[PDB]
Amino acid sequence: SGFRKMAFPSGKVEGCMVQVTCGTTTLNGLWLDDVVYCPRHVICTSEDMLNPNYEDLLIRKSNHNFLVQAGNVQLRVIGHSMQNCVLKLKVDTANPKTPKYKFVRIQPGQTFSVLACYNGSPSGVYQCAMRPNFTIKGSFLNGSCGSVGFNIDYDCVSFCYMHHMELPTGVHAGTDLEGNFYGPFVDRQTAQAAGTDTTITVNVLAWLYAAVINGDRWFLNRFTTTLNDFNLVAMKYNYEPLTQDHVDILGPLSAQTGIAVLDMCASLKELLQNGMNGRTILGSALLEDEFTPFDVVRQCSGVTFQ
Amino acid sequence: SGFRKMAFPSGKVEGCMVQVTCGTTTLNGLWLDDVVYCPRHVICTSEDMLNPNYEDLLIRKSNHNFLVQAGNVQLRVIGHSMQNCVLKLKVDTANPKTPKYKFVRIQPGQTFSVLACYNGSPSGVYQCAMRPNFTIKGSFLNGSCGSVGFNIDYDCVSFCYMHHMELPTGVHAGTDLEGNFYGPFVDRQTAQAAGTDTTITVNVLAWLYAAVINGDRWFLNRFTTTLNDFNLVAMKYNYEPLTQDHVDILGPLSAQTGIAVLDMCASLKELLQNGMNGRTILGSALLEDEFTPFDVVRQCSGVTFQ
Ligand SMILES: *[C@H](O)[C@H](C[C@@H]1CCNC1=O)NC(=O)[C@H](CC(C)(C)C)NC(=O)OCc1cccnc1
Ligand SMILES: *[C@H](O)[C@H](C[C@@H]1CCNC1=O)NC(=O)[C@H](CC(C)(C)C)NC(=O)OCc1cccnc1
């Protein structure tokens, strides 16, 4: 037993991390086969980053302007091109550590692991959710751009995130690995801001099931509620609507615990209306919304990856 | 910016994880050079685990009773011996992925990363602290024994934990890699229980500094306190005494924020006496004690590892 914010083992992604330097700018790249992927603002300098035109900036570049270092070994750039907000540097060496992989784009509410990197060297790994407002609450310092987010499914790495910037509230924005931003953000210095967020209701319910599985039961009650009556309360507390698909996805956890989904909704209702009364759930004094139903089943059952 | 519970990149440890099967029991082993380390209760069966004598059990064993699988490749056991509560299986192949490593024993209050594993396959990674009562609040299911805890220092893996069991409160107990238990626990089925815990005061202060660094300032105040007067309040709320060494270790974070350690103690005092009043610190509604001063400096500064 126990329930922890758990990341995927990072080894398969560590073997892909490289350092990309162009001019004064150094950041991380992702080396898969003979391509290195990195944020396109590497071609920028401190006065270029105000309002740049990357197509104009990139034609002025040469292959030899791009210094790529994989550990203590320098990779020769033999081609370059831009794909939306990422750069693809073609190198003369295929990464022998390339895992089986996919480029996937995730949905708000879904979770992934982040391998934070500086100078092409991995620093730490942690779990993130894509917020409803398409930001992530990460931990990123200068030099972390190009760090990637991912999930692992048996042996296959699904890359879903490349880090690009921090917003003024301290949250983070980035792209999928095709270079398309998550949310209404651009890789320029403007007055961009996150904008309003909501709480991921289905995830909170998943976590309440995790709690019951782990022996926290004090918030359970004999009452029930209809889906519509729950959603009236959800809206008042800035929770997203729960759909019948959410109810269906919570079926397995319902069945394992014997607690009907709508019953657990009544519990959430009371928790929202009365608070916690000085008690905790799974060591938290707040309702936690960054575990998906999949995360709970994985951890509270024990799935591995080769 | 941002502050997350961050584990070390796990790749160096993933390359050491193997599966050890003896009779009906399967668990994880740690393969370094030509030795596989695993919990000695692998030599036990369901009626042996009540009150065993492992010396008697082990002389009855043959090398060929031990099935060791590194991925899809079977390692020939050529020797075995017991070291306290771990078994050392000598194998005919040195692990070509052996990192530079040390076996270290950690102190209560210190943190480490856990690579949770099943059947020799890594499942997830997460950060743990050694509680003052020598338990860890982990996430471990059947088959997880032999999973190891570790820290990484540049390129060197310091192994500090091997998982052995779960206590009746859902917390976890294990050994260092010399096979000596953390705390007053034995690898047998008895009525063992955790016993009383305390909150790691120096870590809470470290986390308050992390919060200030990240823009959470509402809990700051103009008051100060003496170390003795703080420790009188600490004892009342079941916090460990703060020592002058703790104060010294918090110096750098004090200097970075301009908040004297004893000033931050006055803030902690008020937080303990008034609670949080519906506010949060770094996304938590409780005082967090599983980040060390080192963890805060590492994350709030950006140290990496090769
Ligand atoms: C890339 O390494 C960097 C990552 C930032 C730096 C601090 N935390 C991060 O996540 N990204 C940027 O510096 C980005 C550059 C572009 C606007 C994409 C061109 N700008 C940015 O994040 O500005 C906000 C910021 C910068 C530095 C410190 N705090 C906030
Ligand atoms: C080893 O894989 C296993 C790990 C346990 C199982 C559930 N969570 C864990 O951490 N360890 C044991 O089963 C251990 C065996 C010895 C007493 C060391 C011989 N016993 C144990 O942990 O008993 C408590 C328990 C077992 C199973 C489920 N919940 C609690």
Question: In chain B, what residues touch A172 (CB-CB under 8 Å)?
Answer: 2
C-alpha A135/C-alpha A149 separation (Å) is: 13
Tokens found for residue A106: 């995730």
Chain B contact for A15 (CB, 8 A cutoff): yes
Q: How far apart are CA B139 and CA B113, in angstroms?
A: 12
DSSP B173-199: EEE-TTSPBSSS--SS-S--------B
Q: Tell me the two tokens of residue B32.
A: 């370094």
Going by C-alpha positions, the residue among A203, A66, A187, A224 that lies closest to residue A132 is A203
Cα B117 to ligand 2 centre (Å): 14
Distance CA(B22)–CA(B52), nearest Å, equals 16
Nearest to B148 by CA among B90, B192, B103, B193: B103
Give me the phi and psi of A118, to 5 degrees please. -140, 135
Backbone angles phi and psi of B190, in degrees to 5: -135, -170
Structure tokens belonging to residue B147? 């999973």
Among A201, A190, A142, A197, smallest CA distance to A167 is for A190
**Distance of alpha carbon A172 from the chain centroid:** 10
Of all protein residues, the one whose alpha carbon is nearest to atom 5 of ligand 2 is: B165
Closest CA to A40 of B287, A51, A27: A27
Query: How far is Cα B71 from Cα A190, in angstroms, rounded to an integer?
Result: 50
List phi, psi (to 5°) of B242.
-90, 130
Rounded distance, CA A199 to CA B190, Å?
A: 44
Tell how far CA A85 is from the center of its chain: 18
Give bridge partners of residue A29 from the DSSP assignment: A18
- Which atom of ligand 1 is nearest to A143's Cα? 2
Quoted resolution (Å): 1.6
> CA A92, CA B33: separation in Å to the nearest integer?
34
| SS3 state at B32 | strand
Ligand lying closest to the C-alpha of residue B147: 2
Which residues touch B110 (CB under 8 Å, ≥6 apart)?
Answer: B129, B130, B160, B292
- In terms of phi and psi (left: phi > 0; alpha: psi -120 to 50; beta: otherwise), the region of B71 is left
- What are the tokens at B245? 């060494």
Which residues, at least 6 apart from A288, have a Cβ–Cβ distance to it below 8 Å? A203, A204, A207, A281, A282
Atom of ligand 1 nearest to the CA of A167: 24
State whether residue B153 sits within 8 Å of chain A by CB: no
CA dist., res. B304 & res. A119, Å (int): 8
CA–CA gap between residue A106 and residue A1 (Å, rounded): 29
The answer to whether the beta carbons of residues B111 and B295 sit under 8 Å apart is yes
Give the H or E element holding residue B83.
strand B77-83
Q: Rounded CA gap, B284 and B207, in Å?
A: 11
Length of chain B, please?
306
Closest CA to A1 of B163, B279, B97: B163
Ligand 1 neighbour A263 (Cβ under 6 A): no
Cβ atoms of residues A164 and A147 within 8 Å: no
Q: How many residues does chain A have?
A: 306
Helices (H) and strands (E) in chain B, counts: 8, 13
Say if strands A101-103 and A156-166 run parallel, antiparallel, or are unpaired.
Answer: parallel
| Ligand in closest contact with the CA of A39 | 1
Instruction: Give the span between the Cα atoms of B215 and B209, in whole angstroms.
Output: 10
User: Rounded to whole angstroms, how far apart are CA atoms B181 and A160?
Assistant: 41
Interatomic CA distance for residues A31 and A39, integer angstroms: 13
Among B111, B115, B16, smallest CA distance to B68 is for: B16
Residue with tokens 């083992």: A9
CB pairs under 8 A between A and B: 157
Shortest CA distance from A282: residue in chain B: B137
Question: What is the nearest CA distance from B59 to chain A, expressed in angstroms?
Answer: 33
Q: How far apart are CA B215 and CA B208, in angstroms?
A: 11
Written as one string, the DSSP assignment of A70-135 is ETTEEEPEEEEEEETTEEEEEESS--TTPPSEEE--PPTT-EEEEEEEETTEEEEEEEEE--TTS-
Asked if A172 and A76 touch (Cβ cutoff 8 Å), the reply is no
Q: DSSP states of B203-262 as a string?
A: HHHHHHHHHHHTT--TT--S----HHHHHHHHHHTTBPPPPHHHHHHTHHHHHHHT--HH
Of B80, B109, B67, give the one whose Cα is nearest residue B249.
B109
Identity of the residue in A10, A124, A303 whose CB atom sits nearest the CB atom of B11 = A10
Rounded-to-integer distance, Cα B303 and Cα B24, Å:
44
Residues of chain A with a following break (C to N over 2.5 Å): none
User: Token pair for residue A211?
Assistant: 């709690």
Q: Which of B1, B7, B8 sits opposite A166 (nearest CB)?
A: B1
How many Cβ atoms from other residues are within 10 Å of residue A141's Cβ? Answer: 15
| CA angle, B17 then A158 then A9, to 5° | 25
State the SS3 of A234-286: HHHCCECCCCHHHHHHCHHHHHHHCCCHHHHHHHHHHHHHHCCCCCCECCECC
What is the C-alpha to C-alpha distance for residues B144 and B147, in angstroms, rounded to an integer? 6
CA distance A219 to A197: 26
Residue A295 DSSP class: H
Question: Whose atoms come closest to the Cα of B190: which ligand?
Answer: 2
Cβ–Cβ below 8 Å for B285 and A285 = yes
Q: Which residues pair with B6 in a beta bridge?
A: none
Task: Name the helix (H) or strand (E) containing B58.
Answer: helix B54-59
Q: CB-side exposure of B167: number of CA atoms within 13 Å?
A: 20
Q: Which domains does chain A have, with CATH numbers?
A: 1-14+100-197 (2.40.10.10), 15-99 (2.40.10.10), 198-301 (1.10.1840.10)
Burial of residue A280 (CB within 10 Å: 0-12, 13-18, 19+) is: middle
Rounded to the nearest angstrom, the distance between the alpha carbon of B170 and the centre of ligand 2 is 10
- A160 with A105: CB under 8 angstroms? yes
Q: What residues of B act catalytically?
A: 41, 145
Ligand 1 binding pocket includes A165 (Cβ within 6 Å): yes
Burial of A167 (0-12, 13-18, 19+ CB in 10 A): middle
Return the ∠ at Cα B298 (arms to A149 and A110), rounded to 5°: 20
- CA gap A153, A149 in Å, rounded: 14
Instruction: Report the Cα B115 to chain-centroid distance in Å.
Output: 10
- Cα(B166)–Cα(B176) distance, rounded to whole angstroms? 16
What DSSP letter does each residue of B246-290 carry, written as one string?
A: HHHHTHHHHHHHT--HHHHHHHHHHHHHH--TT--BTTBSS----
End-to-end CA distance of chain A: 23
* Structure obtained using: X-ray
Give the closest residue to B144 by CA, choosing from B170, B172, B184. B172
